[PDB]
Amino acid sequence: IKSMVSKAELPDNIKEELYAKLIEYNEKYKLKKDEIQAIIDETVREYQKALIEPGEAVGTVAAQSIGEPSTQMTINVTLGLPRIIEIVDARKNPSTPIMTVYLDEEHRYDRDKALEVARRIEGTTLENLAREETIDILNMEYVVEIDPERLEKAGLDMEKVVRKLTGSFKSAEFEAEGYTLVVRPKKVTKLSDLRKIAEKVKKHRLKGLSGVGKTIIRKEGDEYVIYTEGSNFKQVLKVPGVDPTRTRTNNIWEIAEVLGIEAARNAIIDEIVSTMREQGLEVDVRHIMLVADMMTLDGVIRPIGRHGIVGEKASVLARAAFEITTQHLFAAAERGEVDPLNGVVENVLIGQPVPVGTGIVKLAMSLPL
Amino acid sequence: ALATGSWPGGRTGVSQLLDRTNYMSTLSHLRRVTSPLSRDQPHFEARDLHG
Amino acid sequence: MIVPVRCFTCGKVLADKYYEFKKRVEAGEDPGKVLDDLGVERYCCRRTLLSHVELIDQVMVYK
Amino acid sequence: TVRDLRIPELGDKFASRHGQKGVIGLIVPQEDMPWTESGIVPDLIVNPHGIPSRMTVGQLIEAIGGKVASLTGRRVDGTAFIGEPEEKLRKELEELGFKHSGREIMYDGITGRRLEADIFIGVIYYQRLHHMVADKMHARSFGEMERDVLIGHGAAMLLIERLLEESDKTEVWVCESCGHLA
Amino acid sequence: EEVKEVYINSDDGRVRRPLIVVENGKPKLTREHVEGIKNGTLTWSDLIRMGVIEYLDAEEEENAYVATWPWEVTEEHTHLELMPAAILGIPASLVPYPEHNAAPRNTYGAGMAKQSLGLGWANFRIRVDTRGHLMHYPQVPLVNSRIMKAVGFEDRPAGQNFVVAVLSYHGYNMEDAVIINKASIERGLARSTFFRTYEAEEKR
Amino acid sequence: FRYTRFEKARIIGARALQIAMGAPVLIDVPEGITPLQAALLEFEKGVIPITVIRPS
Amino acid sequence: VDPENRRAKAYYLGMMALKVLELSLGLRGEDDKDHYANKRLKLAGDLLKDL
Amino acid sequence: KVIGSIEFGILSPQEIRKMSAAEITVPDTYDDDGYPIEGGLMDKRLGVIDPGLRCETCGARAGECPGHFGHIELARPVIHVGFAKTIHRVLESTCRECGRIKLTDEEIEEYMQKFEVMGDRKGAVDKLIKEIHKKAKERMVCPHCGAPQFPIKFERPTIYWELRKDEEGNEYKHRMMPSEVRDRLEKIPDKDLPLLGLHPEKSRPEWMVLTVLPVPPVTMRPSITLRAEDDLTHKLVDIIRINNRLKSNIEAGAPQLIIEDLWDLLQYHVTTYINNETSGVPPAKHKSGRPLKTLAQRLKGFSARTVISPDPMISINEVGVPLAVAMELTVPEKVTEFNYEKLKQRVLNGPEKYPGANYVIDPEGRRIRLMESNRELIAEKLDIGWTVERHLEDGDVVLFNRQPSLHRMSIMAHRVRVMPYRTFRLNLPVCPPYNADFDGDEMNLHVPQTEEAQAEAKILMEVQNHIISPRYGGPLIAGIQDHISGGYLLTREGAYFTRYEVEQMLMFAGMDVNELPEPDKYENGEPLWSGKTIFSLLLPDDLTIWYRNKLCDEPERCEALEKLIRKLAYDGFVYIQNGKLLSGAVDKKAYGREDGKLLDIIVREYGVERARQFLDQVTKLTIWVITHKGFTTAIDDEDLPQEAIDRIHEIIREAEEKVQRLIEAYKRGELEPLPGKTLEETLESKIMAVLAEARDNAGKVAERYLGMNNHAVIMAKTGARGKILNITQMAAMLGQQSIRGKRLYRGYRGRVLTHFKPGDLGARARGFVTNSYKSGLTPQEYFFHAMGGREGLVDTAVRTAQSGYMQRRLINALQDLKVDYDGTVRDPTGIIVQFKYGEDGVDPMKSWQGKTVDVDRVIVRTL
Amino acid sequence: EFNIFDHVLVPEHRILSEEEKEELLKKYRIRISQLPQIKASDPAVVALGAKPGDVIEIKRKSPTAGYYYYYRLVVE
Amino acid sequence: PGGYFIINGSERVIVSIEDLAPNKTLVERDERQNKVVAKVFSYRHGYRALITVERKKDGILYVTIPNVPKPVKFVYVMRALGLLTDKEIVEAVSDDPRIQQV
Ligand SMILES: [Mg+2]
Ligand SMILES: [Mg+2]
Ligand SMILES: [Zn+2]
Ligand SMILES: [Zn+2]
Ligand SMILES: [Zn+2]
């Protein structure tokens, strides 16, 4: 009960040891010696016979297995298949990114504490804390106005609204009929273009942290989870309560620029898996891990095609038939330096047995007699 | 030009071979209406059954 | 195309009861009783005579 | 002009007016064919697994309507929106002398005991499509994905076998220290 | 919301639709005219002249509160559908009780009707079609549509009434497959002839 | 201690091809089939002299 | 096609511009170019004319 | 004797002159309409293309004759367009007079050592290449020519300059000649080339300036008969046409300028020969305006098929091949001592009979056609060593294929079982891997020839060897529909098969003689056979497994396990013990694809011969049960009484008024807007959820007033095409019809259909069917359903575009990756992409649903 | 205010001494240039202070093999 | 039923063509190349040409002409057309004062 495991670590891979220990120990039926020996022999038999056979072509099979369910695959915006495409093809800004911000060991169990965070990261311009806009009469020009509701549940008030004058091109002051008035007796800024004022003046507001929009909260097993409608990971960490050990964001690159490359790989795998699972179909994690490893190789996440993995070096022939590529195959071949191989398409184009499959086996037989 | 289904206007498939594979086929073929768009790019607003 | 000589499912004589069938119904006599007066037991054999079309009265006038 | 007699053989395509396409799977002798106590022998037997998955009630209703039509003598009006509500053809079918349920008692032509259930038998209008196997089958004395499949399995020899060795194999002599074809 | 305009189209390519005009609750022209229609009194042209049937293009149909059936004819309904079963086209009319099926299935069957085998030309043995088909013993579909008789499908059908049984026998009808009575085949059922004409021009 | 699938297939094919071009087959006498099945039965008896040299 | 006709096209073009201004103003609603009111069918006749 | 590698580089003048068969000097083609043979560009000991065999010493008739190269002694050097930018990048990065890379000792030492750390990555070597370029380009004091002030270069399309000095503050631009440039590249030592993008041995810089132009062979310049001359030939004609003029002007008088003009002209012509679509170079067109397509436009710009039919009476690895197809497709079998008799009988049977042959190949190689003549004197003293092409025999290795070929499972090796009629027969459980059904689907049939190929397919691609899918840890080949229903009926609580049934039908499988059939569990009511026991007659005597069945839910979840810490009073938690089926019923949980719990276990523990057996015998088992008992769907299976009808009617009315209250509130601007979404979206979102709620409720009502123990319901709850999501649609209601998200709005300017009031946002108005497929759709509903039904057509058919393309991209990226013998996934350029595949090295096709050896299972195995 | 370090998706990065470096490169029978690589710009590298020549030993939790060690070269 | 031609033997039929109504202004959607656009097909005896009046996002408002693309301002074309006075162009666009102010 203290010896078998140790000498079993040789044919085993450590993990199965922890599991086995867990079973044969936690079983109120503690067997004799023979049964334990037999059991370890069997588990090891399984492991040794479950290993991948050298000569396989897991690139192609992982590719096929990951691309197969796609045919059978037909607020939060979110995505589905196009998500798989976005993550596989790098893409700087994923269409409709989301953050699953967690909180540390205090705000995880308090609503009033999670709400503070929520309102503090939401980030609301002026076109959301309003209802509409109108003009004046004669020389009056214009003036602010409603609305009032977005203050009586987020918790912002007319005060820091007066604050706004943080070096603003104008900004006035007059909270009257619930509709804050704003008289501006100056130009050298605006002449009459009240249209382009959509972004600046009204949009160039910030009442909150990060450059994001709506934020929906949802509990999940005695834990409060914050859902973001976009991403700004860098400035999401500098918010009171934000658990730096658990913030998740589907927005790649940002993960690679903040956390690092390994975290980017882990994020790739995690995201692919999550999508596939939230579609119903399942694919073994090892394929996804292969693709992700191959993708985060080189020191930076790069797209799976043309401007990334398919685009990189292989052998000239793997880019020689790169579809009539003037500025490529003409460019690649116009640089005559070296050339290797032991590829795949190069050998089939040339009439050689591909080095995958059986091709990686060599026979031998003494001929007497 | 009438036998090849390619008009002068650069348009093609103006005339087809009257599909005769059974009776219903021909009648349906005479009452067929075609749009002149792209055979590849997706026209989501042109394909949906309009009211 | 002139009554499928005999029948398909019930495969017995039925062509020989074409004319009198048609002509009997061509006076107002409901076919579902005319058939009964003749050798028309099961409906499978009845169908072959019910839903026939005799297209031939078009095709001959040719070659 | 040449005519070719064509008997509905194994593989030909058949389909009703309900998008219920199918291929003849086996031609079984009428003897082995099961018969209903009323004397009816099926012309076409469709698997019961091609109905609840799809949602085509119109085919079943059409079966019942064809049964009623065969019995009564009426041709039955199935015009959209204005045809007999199914339950009326169901309620008439019996007074004509048949279970409302479209099903009857069928006997197994092989062994002989009648099946311990009721068998939905109807008269549905099937259309023969122009997809005759006589014009599909042909033999000879494979692109990207078709390469990738052999690659996935790992059949290299089989690849070469199919794409080269059986076409234009050309032999050239390469110099050893030169690299230029001799 | 603040403009009133009046458009008049009298062009050369507008797609209209005939409708029974309904002033108040009473649709224009009643049994008085149906009685005469069944007779050789008033043709349909005489009808459009009289003022019962009216051609509405899209633009004019914009100002219309159409009543489905003649039973819901309130004093607001502008027009009245003669027959909603005419919504679909000629091939979709071949499907019996289409309102009891799914849209995709109806699409399949309707588009598949143009593949059925039968007589589509009384003059086939003189025709010179590239490839033609002729179903030996065709049959009028039982439980069909009123349209099928007017279209002339009843006069030139393409298929047969198979007495079908629903069960999996022997496991040879699984996956959409279908099992066929040998005898029925051997007696004519579902037999057809293929036609193909080759030509030879004495080129000079 | 064993072979991989690819090695098995490879060896079988090789032996079969050897048998095709002549080359007497080891213990087989009462048979009546192609060289492939001959190499296959030969393999079922583990008498195929073809060894897989593995790069290690 | 004549020089007198210019004066008319003017007005027409004006209206075209007007429509544009209206849609950017949020008082037009984008033209449903799939609505059969704005759809015209070319039958055999006019095709044969153009030929 | 096969290709190890290929090493690209740049051809030296010496090579082109040595590899040439003759010096081309006469600028002419064939000429003309009779007698096409000259002494410059055409077959002057160079190549054969007409039916006349004469050639360059090698004779070698037009049939089979590899083309021979030629050369052209260029009167003057000519810059190669392909190297122009490279030549430039070289010139202003190195020193004239010197030959050095304008780098300090230190710089070279540490640069080369930073150049070896990158010696494989083509992408990352260019960064440092250009960086080096710019670092040298800024200097003017090289360490190997006492520094003489370097006049920066200019370029393009093929011209070079040097802004030298002679006056003082001047910056005149001395022109650059190909002779000068080439002779200036010939100084750069072999030591400096590695620091650039060149080689000392493979690609010398001086060779970038062509001194001899290699002429393509006759075989590469075929004439396209009507003759449509070859473009290459024409442009070549122009090139020699100027070349000779140039040489003739150099030999004679030398006004310099003349030679310059002619030189630059020659330059133009060669530039066009290399690339007609170049930049800054007027495309040399043919007398029609149609541009000549040269080199840069040149390298740019045994099977069968038929319908399929089912056959659960053939082995799972077998394929039904129509004997006519078998008589066309043949196999090469060399006559040996074991088939001497067979093949002789085959060839004697001729192309007729059934086991006949069509061709015979004698050892010389001459093919003999058995048609004509007779099989008599042909089939004589064949002797060993010949080859017969015999018709397909029962058992031959054959590839079965169905397009589209998604996963690998789309092409599988089968065993020919020759049968009449005219379709391919596929055993039913092998339908999921092919994704085939029947309606009209056709498949491909391949017949491999070389013994190596056949074997390889038979050893590695055989059906039985791929029951489990590599995508997920589970079986792909299994029960489909009736197999599931049959497994249920066979393993039911009330499953009592009289002797007549058991005895006669076990012949669909096998296995009895002695201690198998025994002994009739029930003689209570009558001597009879319990279905559990009959099923038990297949599983091996040691598989003990237990997993909850599909019905182990709702308040019928329960439990009541009991571990070993024998009677039988259980039902749900399927318990099989040493082949004995104690408790449980067979369904989608028990058999079928996708699952991962029984068929999975018998293939891990006993993979090839057993797995196929259990599969093969079970189908025929399950099928005969279904067949002999009667299995159907009637029309009454979906019928509900009046009570359920009145109930549903009241429910849909409730939902209607719920929507109206929402609308009346929206009209009066009674606000209440959702947090995130826009006001207009709040209204829609609230309604959709309200109606969806009511829809599921209506369906919940429908499952109560419908007998759950008739055929149809069995299929829904069992495992043969089922889904409560569709049941609700058939009996209760279809629900809200949507278009790309939002409701059905696209219609008239004020509404969807002309039967509603303008602006009516009611339930029925914006496309909501209240009736199901049973009760029948109204005129409006039928149209709405059609508008909503167009979705499935467009969506499912559009997804193919992105699926196929995306997959094609990642396939063309990973197709090179393999598992090396050291258990490592490496790219074809020797780059460890993954130390030990998938981290653990366990093939997903061979792992227990992702787990690297299902530990809890292995431990239990202690009996 | 704490730090990154073995947190959300961050594995145990360590630096290799010459010994384990040479031995590791000897085991897998490969050259220095054949390893996956990191950049000096990589945050996780600058935090651990990695120089263009180090081979980071990365220890991550794998939901299949549990604990896995990867290796990469710091570059630019 | 007829409705088809017999050319060279084979029965040729003209498939009815669904075109967007000729001679008409239609305001396109938004932000593909630049905000809102109106589109006008116009037909005259065989030839058919297009005339867009796109209002791009700064109020320039151009017009397209068949002969060589390069758009010109609405007012340029309007004055070259036949409208001289600014009151003419302005009031020709619309008689509405507010719209006139733009
Ligand atoms: Mg299918
Ligand atoms: Mg199919
Ligand atoms: Zn009968
Ligand atoms: Zn030669
Ligand atoms: Zn120098």
Side-chain angles (χ1 to χ4, degrees), chain D residues 4-180:
Chain D
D4 188 31
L5 216 204
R6 299 271 260 265
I7 272 71
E9 65 161 321
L10 241 217
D12 284 6
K13 195 179 184 209
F14 279 66
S16 70
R17 321 125 81 183
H18 297 282
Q20 210 80 325
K21 31 182 180 64
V23 153
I24 296 191
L26 178 58
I27 168 183
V28 35
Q30 180 198 287
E31 301 76 345
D32 314 68
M33 288 272 81
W35 68 113
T36 280
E37 289 179 345
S38 310
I40 337 294
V41 179
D43 280 334
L44 279 185
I45 311 196
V46 183
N47 201 288
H49 282 92
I51 309 267
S53 55
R54 318 239 182 281
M55 312 174 254
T56 54
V57 190
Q59 195 163 191
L60 306 119
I61 307 181
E62 199 222 289
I64 300 188
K67 180 93 83 56
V68 170
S70 205
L71 296 174
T72 294
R74 202 107 340 101
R75 209 174 246 137
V76 183
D77 184 22
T79 292
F81 317 123
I82 46 166
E84 315 45 332
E86 60 151 323
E87 55 187 323
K88 249 170 194 53
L89 288 181
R90 295 227 306 255
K91 288 213 189 313
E92 282 300 291
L93 186 61
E94 185 197 323
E95 320 226 305
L96 277 165
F98 272 130
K99 179 71 56 261
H100 90 195
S101 200
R103 11 165 71 168
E104 296 154 83
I105 277 69
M106 187 157 271
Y107 283 71
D108 183 16
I110 305 146
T111 69
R113 311 101 214 284
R114 66 200 231 204
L115 29 78
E116 353 101 333
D118 296 18
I119 304 325
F120 188 87
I121 264 228
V123 188
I124 101 190
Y125 186 69
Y126 258 89
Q127 346 181 49
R128 269 216 72 197
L129 274 61
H130 62 266
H131 300 307
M132 324 198 54
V133 66
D135 299 8
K136 317 309 286 282
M137 150 184 146
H138 85 283
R140 185 85 185 182
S141 51
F142 211 88
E144 302 222 347
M145 297 185 179
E146 323 294 326
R147 156 187 64 85
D148 296 306
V149 51
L150 296 194
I151 292 185
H153 288 261
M157 295 307 118
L158 198 62
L159 275 162
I160 298 180
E161 168 70 24
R162 171 55 33 184
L163 215 60
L164 200 164
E165 252 264 330
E166 287 170 320
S167 188
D168 45 8
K169 196 160 225 189
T170 301
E171 172 82 57
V172 231
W173 290 273
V174 192
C175 183
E176 291 169 36
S177 349
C178 295
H180 313 333

Side-chain angles (χ1 to χ4, degrees), chain H residues 354-413:
Chain H
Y354 318 92
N358 293 348
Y359 296 89
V360 96
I361 304 186
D362 64 76
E364 190 119 330
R366 190 167 79 87
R367 191 192 299 276
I368 293 296
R369 311 95 216 193
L370 302 171
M371 348 207 195
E372 286 85 70
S373 84
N374 275 345
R375 327 97 239 197
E376 294 266 60
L377 284 174
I378 287 197
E380 284 293 345
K381 285 156 301 168
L382 311 110
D383 259 15
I384 255 183
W386 287 32
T387 308
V388 133
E389 295 189 19
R390 59 165 179 81
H391 297 188
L392 260 43
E393 247 176 54
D394 300 294
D396 273 284
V397 192
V398 135
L399 310 318
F400 213 22
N401 179 31
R402 190 208 127 73
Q403 298 161 314
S405 310
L406 275 49
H407 48 196
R408 69 175 178 183
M409 334 293 287
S410 293
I411 266 196
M412 295 164 68

Side-chain angles (χ1 to χ4, degrees), chain H residues 94-100 102 142-148 150:
Chain H
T94 192
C95 168
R96 318 146 62 228
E97 264 215 47
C98 55
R100 216 229 267 271
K102 302 160 72 187
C142 57
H144 260 39
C145 55
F150 291 136

